[PDB]
UniProtKB/Swiss-Prot annotation, chains A, B:
InterPro entries: Ketosteroid_isomerase (IPR039256), NTF2-like_dom_sf (IPR032710), SnoaL-like (IPR037401). The keyword Isomerase applies. This is Steroid Delta-isomerase. Homodimer. Transmembrane segments: none annotated. Its EC number is 5.3.3.1. The active site is at 15 (proton donor), 39 (proton acceptor). GO terms for biological process: steroid metabolic process. It catalyses: a 3-oxo-Delta(5)-steroid = a 3-oxo-Delta(4)-steroid.
Length: 123, 123
């Protein structure tokens, strides 16, 4: 069923947990088969689980954690603030991000928009 | 001109500052004359500065502060996490929110979506 506000909080937190551990298959499974991802927002969207899987495999030594509670709505959507820590050619980096997600009637991520730019990056 | 990522950070932070001090006129001036506001997201949108002014006058003993940096994009958009403190019939309340904004070619807020629900509220 369309996720309730409480369920959205759990689903989005789960997403962060999956990125943190780096389970690509589990992350991809959270998305609708034809979901769209805009990360960073403003960039062209990628479509489908294949493109989304390639995207995450490409990006995933990484750590991710919520930096504040997940804000959830009553229409299957939510937004959350988090921090990603990674390594770029042996160099430690950090990025502040906010993901906005819209879930479908099956509890899967239909669309995701990740807000961030170089002003939120530390290399 | 369309706000750069850095300008978006400043504009959105200014918005929070204006809510914190409670300057309704200044807040309203930040919006495009025909801007739309969905607060909380999922609720019907209000349109125009008159409706937006009535909305803020209605809501504004209030304090607001960013709880993390403003995430800004390169296409005039951004998202920010913040906390609002207010009083409901002499009772102190708090609310965690994330505002997503799209600015126009004149640096004004074209659309704003505020994510939050009762799960983010403390009365």
């Amino acid at each position: 069923n369309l996720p309730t506000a409480q369920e959205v909080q759990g689903l989005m937190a789960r997403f962060i947990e999956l990125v943190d551990v780096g389970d690509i298959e589990a992350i991809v499974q959270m998305y609708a088969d034809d979901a769209t991802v805009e990360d960073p927002f403003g960039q062209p969207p990628i479509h489908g689980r294949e493109q989304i899987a390639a995207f995450f495999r490409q990006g995933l030594k990484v750590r991710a954690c919520l930096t504040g509670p997940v804000r959830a709505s009553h229409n299957g959507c939510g937004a959350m603030p988090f921090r990603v820590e990674m390594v770029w050619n042996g160099q430690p980096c950090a990025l502040d991000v906010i993901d906005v997600m819209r879930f479908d009637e099956h509890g899967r991520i239909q669309t995701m928009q990740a807000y961030w730019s170089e002003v939120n990056l530390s290399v």
